[PDB]
Design an enzyme around this catalytic site. Structure first.
Site, PDB file in Angstrom:
ATOM      1  N   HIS A 153       0.765  -1.232   0.000  1.00 27.08           N
ATOM      2  CA  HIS A 153       0.000   0.000   0.000  1.00 27.08           C
ATOM      3  C   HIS A 153       0.810   1.304   0.000  1.00 27.08           C
ATOM      4  O   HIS A 153       0.336   2.312  -0.529  1.00 27.08           O
ATOM      5  CB  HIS A 153      -0.946  -0.008   1.198  1.00 27.08           C
ATOM      6  CG  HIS A 153      -2.329  -0.469   0.870  1.00 27.08           C
ATOM      7  ND1 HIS A 153      -2.899  -1.590   1.442  1.00 27.08           N
ATOM      8  CD2 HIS A 153      -3.263   0.044   0.039  1.00 27.08           C
ATOM      9  CE1 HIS A 153      -4.127  -1.744   0.981  1.00 27.08           C
ATOM     10  NE2 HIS A 153      -4.373  -0.766   0.128  1.00 27.08           N
ATOM     11  N   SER A 253     -25.298   9.736  -8.453  1.00 22.50           N
ATOM     12  CA  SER A 253     -25.529   8.301  -8.492  1.00 22.50           C
ATOM     13  C   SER A 253     -24.664   7.582  -7.453  1.00 22.50           C
ATOM     14  O   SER A 253     -25.139   6.666  -6.774  1.00 22.50           O
ATOM     15  CB  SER A 253     -25.259   7.763  -9.901  1.00 22.50           C
ATOM     16  OG  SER A 253     -24.853   6.407  -9.873  1.00 22.50           O
ATOM     17  N   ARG A 288      -8.764  17.314  -6.888  1.00 21.54           N
ATOM     18  CA  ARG A 288      -9.152  18.360  -5.940  1.00 21.54           C
ATOM     19  C   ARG A 288      -8.016  19.337  -5.630  1.00 21.54           C
ATOM     20  O   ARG A 288      -8.268  20.527  -5.419  1.00 21.54           O
ATOM     21  CB  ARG A 288      -9.691  17.724  -4.646  1.00 21.54           C
ATOM     22  CG  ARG A 288     -11.005  16.960  -4.869  1.00 21.54           C
ATOM     23  CD  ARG A 288     -11.380  16.059  -3.698  1.00 21.54           C
ATOM     24  NE  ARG A 288     -12.486  15.149  -4.017  1.00 21.54           N
ATOM     25  CZ  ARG A 288     -13.769  15.366  -3.724  1.00 21.54           C
ATOM     26  NH1 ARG A 288     -14.154  16.485  -3.105  1.00 21.54           N
ATOM     27  NH2 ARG A 288     -14.679  14.455  -4.054  1.00 21.54           N
ATOM     28  N   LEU A 289      -6.776  18.846  -5.613  1.00 22.49           N
ATOM     29  CA  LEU A 289      -5.615  19.702  -5.358  1.00 22.49           C
ATOM     30  C   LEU A 289      -5.511  20.741  -6.450  1.00 22.49           C
ATOM     31  O   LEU A 289      -5.648  20.416  -7.634  1.00 22.49           O
ATOM     32  CB  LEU A 289      -4.333  18.880  -5.281  1.00 22.49           C
ATOM     33  CG  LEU A 289      -4.294  17.853  -4.148  1.00 22.49           C
ATOM     34  CD1 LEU A 289      -3.296  16.735  -4.445  1.00 22.49           C
ATOM     35  CD2 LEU A 289      -3.972  18.529  -2.828  1.00 22.49           C
ATOM     36  N   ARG A 290      -5.304  21.997  -6.075  1.00 20.55           N
ATOM     37  CA  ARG A 290      -5.458  23.052  -7.073  1.00 20.55           C
ATOM     38  C   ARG A 290      -4.154  23.611  -7.627  1.00 20.55           C
ATOM     39  O   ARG A 290      -4.180  24.333  -8.625  1.00 20.55           O
ATOM     40  CB  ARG A 290      -6.316  24.190  -6.533  1.00 20.55           C
ATOM     41  CG  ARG A 290      -7.677  24.269  -7.229  1.00 20.55           C
ATOM     42  CD  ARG A 290      -7.697  25.281  -8.383  1.00 20.55           C
ATOM     43  NE  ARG A 290      -7.437  26.660  -7.960  1.00 20.55           N
ATOM     44  CZ  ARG A 290      -8.379  27.515  -7.561  1.00 20.55           C
ATOM     45  NH1 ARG A 290      -9.651  27.129  -7.507  1.00 20.55           N
ATOM     46  NH2 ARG A 290      -8.049  28.753  -7.199  1.00 20.55           N
ATOM     47  N   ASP A 380      -4.740  -5.806 -20.775  1.00 20.85           N
ATOM     48  CA  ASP A 380      -4.702  -6.731 -21.904  1.00 20.85           C
ATOM     49  C   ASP A 380      -3.226  -6.995 -22.191  1.00 20.85           C
ATOM     50  O   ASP A 380      -2.507  -6.078 -22.592  1.00 20.85           O
ATOM     51  CB  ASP A 380      -5.411  -6.119 -23.121  1.00 20.85           C
ATOM     52  CG  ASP A 380      -5.532  -7.079 -24.323  1.00 20.85           C
ATOM     53  OD1 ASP A 380      -4.728  -8.039 -24.449  1.00 20.85           O
ATOM     54  OD2 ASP A 380      -6.440  -6.837 -25.167  1.00 20.85           O
TER      55      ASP A 380
HETATM   56  O1  LIG Z   1      -8.354   0.859  -3.208  1.00 19.26           O
HETATM   57  C1  LIG Z   1      -7.215   0.637  -2.768  1.00 19.26           C
HETATM   58  C2  LIG Z   1      -6.135   0.034  -3.583  1.00 19.26           C
HETATM   59  C3  LIG Z   1      -6.383  -0.262  -4.860  1.00 19.26           C
HETATM   60  C4  LIG Z   1      -5.528  -0.858  -5.852  1.00 19.26           C
HETATM   61  C5  LIG Z   1      -6.026  -1.560  -6.966  1.00 19.26           C
HETATM   62  C6  LIG Z   1      -5.168  -2.124  -7.893  1.00 19.26           C
HETATM   63  C7  LIG Z   1      -3.782  -1.995  -7.708  1.00 19.26           C
HETATM   64  O2  LIG Z   1      -2.911  -2.550  -8.614  1.00 19.26           O
HETATM   65  C8  LIG Z   1      -3.243  -1.299  -6.591  1.00 19.26           C
HETATM   66  C9  LIG Z   1      -4.123  -0.730  -5.686  1.00 19.26           C
HETATM   67  O3  LIG Z   1      -6.869   0.916  -1.479  1.00 19.26           O
HETATM   68  C10 LIG Z   1      -7.913   1.096  -0.522  1.00 19.26           C
HETATM   69  C11 LIG Z   1      -7.503   1.746   0.750  1.00 19.26           C
HETATM   70  C12 LIG Z   1      -8.305   1.811   1.800  1.00 19.26           C
HETATM   71  C13 LIG Z   1      -8.364   3.080   2.691  1.00 19.26           C
HETATM   72  O4  LIG Z   1      -7.796   4.101   2.277  1.00 19.26           O
HETATM   73  O5  LIG Z   1      -9.002   2.966   3.784  1.00 19.26           O
HETATM   74  C14 LIG Z   1      -9.510   0.941   1.904  1.00 19.26           C
HETATM   75  C15 LIG Z   1      -9.380  -0.435   1.150  1.00 19.26           C
HETATM   76  O6  LIG Z   1     -10.650  -0.924   0.837  1.00 19.26           O
HETATM   77  C16 LIG Z   1      -8.657  -0.317  -0.227  1.00 19.26           C
HETATM   78  O7  LIG Z   1      -7.843  -1.434  -0.499  1.00 19.26           O
END
Ligand SMILES: O=C(/C=C/c1ccc(O)cc1)O[C@@H]1C=C(C(=O)O)C[C@@H](O)[C@@H]1O
Length: 431
Positions: A153, A253, A288-290, A380
């Site tokens: 992450h 939506s 959003r960052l300007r 793909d």
């Molecule tokens: O959406 C993402 C990551 C997505 C992602 C998708 C494909 C990739 O190759 C790499 C990253 O992170 C999120 C962070 C979270 C948060 O900020 O609380 C809440 C979580 O549900 C979630 O995993």
């Protein structure tokens, strides 16, 4: 479902890459703790060629040149702050076979056993001991194949991660990089000195259960993961319910749907009327960052919206009241609010305390992260776009994902983890 590992390579960048330490911004740190799991499914074309490991591994090597931090490692700096060690150690790439067929997965709910399609990472050792990115190609008995992705992450949110996965798929098809990655997170540095302008509800601790939960009904061991499709009919009906009880205001939506899921989870859990429920909404801040971030910016730009309601109001009032709360928080998040957020994070002594996790989304609360605007179907590699892409598992009770249609029919899917007994009731979401 049994997986038989065939091969396992540590793939390194095709050429020398910058040896450097890559700084993590505050929103790169308060992000969840491990590897974000995603899975792709591909029908066979009938070609022998199909997802040839050599083609994949060579293309992966190439893509790891412009996206070289992806092949680095986690480490701490002198002040103990987590950073990305760009050492080109590589990316784990696994090839697997299974007697199962894709159709066996039915609807592709990100259950535990779907997680089997991504390689497992032992975090209990060093912080530096595991790849930032793990990849698995699994060949099914039907001739089909899956791509399991597990991306640490700190490295990338959805936009930056898919920037890499898709550049990779492009390269597999002989194509070149299109948008070069901008690799510098110091654009999201806090001001000096920091100066929060807001009280950030998003970083305040989540409501606990006024009445403690039964650990046999709650907890990781009795949580179910399902997915549900909503047709555009159901979605159109849903947005139209903004009319109800004379409300003149038209909400989006996404607002009406998020409000509907939030309200439906609330009913399902049978919350007391005086119980507070907090909704966590991962919000891309790129738009959003300007000053406005460069194209290709590589990292996390995830900020966090957290509407909150008392279950008494949330469940008794019309869906558009939920939509309203969501709108009221989303519309405040302009550039001035996000700069506040960075400064607020800066003034915390321990950011690890703000790292969202199981305690963040679990009942009475909820996380809903939208992938609808992410280019998830673009991978793909030469044999066609995926028939499905979604989360590779939902490890946290209370967390949920909104996925777009692989066929552009205007339907959406909600992929969600709830306590077992609440899940059945959560079909109440199809009201
Ligand atoms: O959406 C993402 C990551 C997505 C992602 C998708 C494909 C990739 O190759 C790499 C990253 O992170 C999120 C962070 C979270 C948060 O900020 O609380 C809440 C979580 O549900 C979630 O995993």
């Amino acid at each position: 479902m049994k997986i038989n590992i065939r091969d396992s390579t540590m793939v390194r960048p095709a050429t020398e890459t910058p040896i450097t330490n890559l700084w993590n911004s505050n929103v790169d740190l308060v992000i969840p703790r491990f590897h974000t799991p995603s899975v792709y499914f591909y029908r066979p074309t009938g070609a022998s060629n199909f997802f040839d490991p050599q083609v994949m591994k060579e293309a992966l090597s190439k893509a790891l040149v412009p996206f070289y931090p992806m092949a680095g490692r986690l480490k701490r700096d002198d002040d103990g702050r987590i950073e990305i060690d760009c050492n080109g150690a590589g990316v784990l790439f696994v090839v697997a076979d299974t007697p199962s067929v894709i159709d066996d997965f039915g609807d592709f709910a990100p259950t535990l056993n779907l997680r089997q399609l991504i390689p497992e990472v032992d975090h209990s050792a060093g912080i530096h001991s595991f790849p930032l990115l793990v990849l698995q190609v699994t060949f099914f008995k039907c001739g089909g194949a899956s791509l399991g992705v597990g991306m640490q992450h700190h490295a990338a949110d959805g936009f930056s991660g898919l920037h890499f996965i898709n550049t990779w798929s492009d390269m597999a098809r002989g194509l070149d990089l299109t948008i070069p990655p901008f690799i510098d997170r110091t654009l999201l540095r806090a001001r000096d000195p920091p100066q929060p302008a807001f009280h950030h509800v998003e970083y305040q601790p989540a409501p606990s259960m006024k009445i403690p939960l039964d650990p046999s009904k709650s907890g990781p061991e009795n949580t179910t993961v399902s997915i549900f499709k909503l047709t555009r009919d159901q979605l159109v009906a849903l947005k139209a319910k903004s009319k109800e009880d004379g409300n003149t205001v038209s909400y989006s939506s996404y607002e009406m749907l998020a409000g509907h899921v939030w309200r439906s989870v609330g009913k399902a859990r049978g919350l007391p009327n005086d119980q507070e429920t907090k909704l966590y909404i991962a919000t891309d801040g790129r738009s959003r960052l300007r000053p406005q971030l460069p194209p290709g910016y590589f990292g996390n730009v995830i900020f966090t919206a957290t509407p909150l309601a008392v279950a008494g109001d949330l469940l008794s009032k019309p869906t558009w009241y939920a939509a309203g709360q969501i709108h009221d928080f989303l519309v405040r998040m302009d550039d001035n609010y996000l700069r506040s957020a960075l400064d607020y994070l800066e003034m915390q002594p321990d950011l690890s305390a703000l790292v969202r996790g199981a305690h963040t989304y679990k009942c009475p609360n909820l996380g809903i992260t939208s992938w609808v605007r992410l280019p998830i179907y673009d991978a793909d590699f030469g044999w066609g776009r995926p028939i499905f892409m979604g989360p590779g598992g939902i490890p946290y009770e209370g967390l949920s994902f909104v996925l777009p249609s692989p066929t552009n029919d205007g339907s959406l899917s909600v992929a969600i983890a709830l306590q077992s007994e609440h899940m059945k009731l959560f079909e109440k979401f199809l009201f």
